[PDB]
Amino acid sequence: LLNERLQHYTLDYVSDRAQHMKNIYDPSSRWFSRSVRPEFPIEEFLPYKTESHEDQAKYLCHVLVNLYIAISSLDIQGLISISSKDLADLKVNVNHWTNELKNCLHFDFPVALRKSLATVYYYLSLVQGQRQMHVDMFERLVSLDDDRTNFTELLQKQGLLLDHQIMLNFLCEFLPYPDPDYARYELSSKEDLQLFRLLLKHAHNAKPFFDKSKESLLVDTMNFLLSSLAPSTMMAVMPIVTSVVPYHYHIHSKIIDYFPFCYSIWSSVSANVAIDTHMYDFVGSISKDVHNKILSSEHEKDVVGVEFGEFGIFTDDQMTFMFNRLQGHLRTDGQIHSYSRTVKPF
Numbered sequence: 001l002l003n004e005r006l007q008h009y010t011l012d013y014v015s016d017r018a019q020h021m022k023n024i025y026d027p028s029s030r031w032f033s034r035s036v037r038p039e040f041p042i043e044e045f046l047p048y049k050t051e052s053h054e055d056q057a058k059y060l061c062h063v064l065v066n067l068y069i070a071i072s073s074l075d076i077q078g079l080i081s082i083s084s085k086d087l088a089d090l091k092v093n094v095n096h097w098t099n100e101l102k103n104c105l106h107f108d109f110p111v112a113l114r115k116s117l118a119t120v121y122y123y124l125s126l127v128q129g130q131r132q133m134h135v136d137m138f139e140r141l142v143s144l145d146d147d148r149t150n151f152t153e154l155l156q157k158q159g160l161l162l163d164h165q166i167m168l169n170f171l172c173e174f175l176p177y178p179d180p181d182y183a184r185y186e187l188s189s190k191e192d193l194q195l196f197r198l199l200l201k202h203a204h205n206a207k208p209f210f211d212k213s214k215e216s217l218l219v220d221t222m223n224f225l226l227s228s229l230a231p232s233t234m235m236a237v238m239p240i241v242t243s244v245v246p247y248h249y250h251i252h253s254k255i256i257d258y259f260p261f262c263y264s265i266w267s268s269v270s271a272n273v274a275i276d277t278h279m280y281d282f283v284g285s286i287s288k289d290v291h292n293k294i295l296s297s298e299h300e301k302d303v304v305g306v307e308f309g310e311f312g313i314f315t316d317d318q319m320t321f322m323f324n325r326l327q328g329h330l331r332t333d334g335q336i337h338s339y340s341r342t343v344k345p346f
Contacts, residue, residue, distance in 0.1 A: 002058065009064060010110045011057040012187040020053055024108055033108045035149040042106075042147075044254070056107040058072045063104055066111075067097040072121070076130040094124075098137055105140060109290065114151065115160045117141055118209075122162050125202050126170055131195075135202045142205060149188075152208055164217060164246070168224075170199055171240045175233060181194060187236060196236075200243040218248045222258055234265075238278040247289050249303045255286060256306055263318060271325065271333040277341075284344030287312050314345075 006012060010030065014020055023029040025037050070092050078093040101117070121138040125131065142152050160265045174196055185192045186320065222245060229237045247255050266279050290313050293303050311319040322345065329336050336342050 004059050005061050006057060009061055010112050011058045011061055013053050015054065017052070024110075024239045027031060031110050033110050033114075034147070035154065036147060038147050056104070058105055060104055060109060063097055063100045066092075066195065067101065068095070068122075070094045070097055071124065074130075076124070076127050077090075093257070095133065098133055102137060102140075111151075111154050111158050114141060115155050118155060118160060119162065121164075122202075122206055122209075126166055130168075131188065132198060135198055135205070138202065139205050139292070142209075151250050156208065157312075160209050161211045164210045164221070164244070167203050167206065168221065168244060171203065171244055172228070174236050198240050203240075203244040207244065207246050210248075212246075212248055215248075215250050215253070218246065218250070218255065219253050223247055225308075226261070238275075241276045242282045242285075247286060249305055251305065254305060259283070259318070263321065266325075267321060271328055271335045273337050276329070276335050277337050280342045280345060281338075283314075284341055287314070287345050 013031065014023070020031070023031045024033045025035070026032055027035075071094055073092060075092070076094050078095055082092055118138060118141045120306050121141060125134040125138060140153060144150055144152055172193070174187060185195065187193060187196065222241075225237055225241050225245070234334055245255070249255070262279055262282060265275065269275050290303055290306055290308065293301055294308055306313060310316075314322070326342075326346070329342075
């Protein structure tokens with residue numbers, strides 16, 4: 001029974017210690033877990049022998065089974081506690097096992113189990129009717145830099161795909177509704193604003209895993225957001241645009257194609273924090289992504305359509321406008337919210 005569940009979770013973990021250590025860093029191995037071996041071993045200098053990787057596999061399998069039992073019971077808030085008497089009369093807590101998984105994250109589990117957990121915690125973070133911990137768990141599962149190992153790239157190569165529509169609907173629930181009383185969320189309540197920011201962060205984390213084979217997702221999403229754009233909804237539209245729209249480069253449609261429209265709103269208004277943000281962020285993130293994919297030739301370079309010229313992916317007028325707005329911020333208005341994201345495009 002235990003062996004079958006270990007095999008299902010890809011936790012076989014052959015008894016040979018050196019062979020297992022070589023396998024966990026081998027991309028072609030079944031138990032591939034990490035790309036870069038730590039130059040300084042993670043406290044391998046302890047004066048005593050720790051537990052083997054076989055015990056870690058059993059503990060992780062037990063945690064996964066308990067987490068599945070807890071989640072499948074459809075009691076996410078954990079207000080109901082079951083004892084042995086409750087089960088006996090007939091004839092489990094999501095947060096507890098999430099904390100257990102957070103503790104166990106240092107066991108270096110294989111990438112397939114990482115994909116399964118990433119899917120589980122991506123779809124667990126969007127439960128309604130029954131939250132920050134789940135978002136943090138998903139973010140840690142897809143961490144960009146973990147001992148100089150990019151888990152997002154490994155999960156993409158494993159073939160991890162997530163549903164864009166559920167996230168888009170959850171984000172769009174904050175748009176105005178024709179009937180005022182039947183509106184779950186608004187943008188005036190502090191709790192609603194915090195939930196909106198949390199959803200934006202989760203969407204930003206889950207964005208790279210959207211299906212790139214759906215060559216119409218970008219166009220449809222951008223058309224919907226453009227048709228939803230209005231002065232009474234721009235404060236909600238712009239962060240959604242910058243957080244949920246994936247960076248897809250097709251022959252017919254590219255994200256760069258939407259650059260002028262943003263500048264249309266950028267040059268038509270005065271310097272303000274609410275509008276200058278979501279403009280530096282979007283363009284800077286896109287430029288950094290283009291640069292990283294160009295430097296990732298033969299492994300992740302499919303952006304041959306987009307060139308990196310004199311000003312990267314910017315025209316002369318766009319760069320001049322950005323520099324003039326930056327000097328206006330530095331000398332006249334000071335309308336800068338985040339400085340790292342402001343300097344990223346430059």
